[PDB]
Design a protein around this ligand. Structure first.
Ligand SMILES: CC[C@H]1Nc2ccc(C(=O)O)cc2NC1=O
Length: 112
């Protein structure tokens, strides 16, 4: 079970997840300029650019560690933003659409 095809699959999966973020609100770190209190209760910020960095640094050597950081993007957003916000609903939608992306990607990983 070879590392190179696995990372290719994670790269494709990450691209598919970013595609579900049409507003690109999850693709870069939360700009602390705009949200100065963000780290007061968000202990591990996460975003798709950071996930890409982690991927290339060989920090995702199994599917579940990759999926855990995606879930962090989602859970951080639900935690920080009030329920009546666009952002909160965006995280709900990303959880749904990304969940389907991840299920299919995990299936394909098991074929390897
Ligand atoms: C939606 C997740 C995370 N991202 C953000 C990006 C930009 C802003 C902004 O006020 O400009 C706010 C957020 N908030 C978030 O929770």
């Amino acid at each position: 079970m070879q590392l190179t095809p696995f990372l290719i699959l994670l790269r494709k999966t990450l691209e598919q997840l970013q595609e579900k973020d049409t507003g690109n609100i999850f693709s870069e770190p939360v700009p602390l300029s705009e949200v100065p209190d963000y780290l007061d209760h968000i202990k591990k910020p996460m975003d798709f650019f950071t996930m890409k960095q982690n991927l290339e640094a060989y920090r995702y050597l199994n599917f579940d560690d990759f999926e855990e950081d995606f879930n962090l993007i989602v859970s951080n957003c639900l935690k920080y933003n009030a329920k009546d916000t666009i952002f909160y609903r965006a995280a709900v939608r990303l959880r749904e659409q990304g969940g389907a992306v991840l299920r299919q990607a995990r299936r394909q990983a098991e074929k390897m």
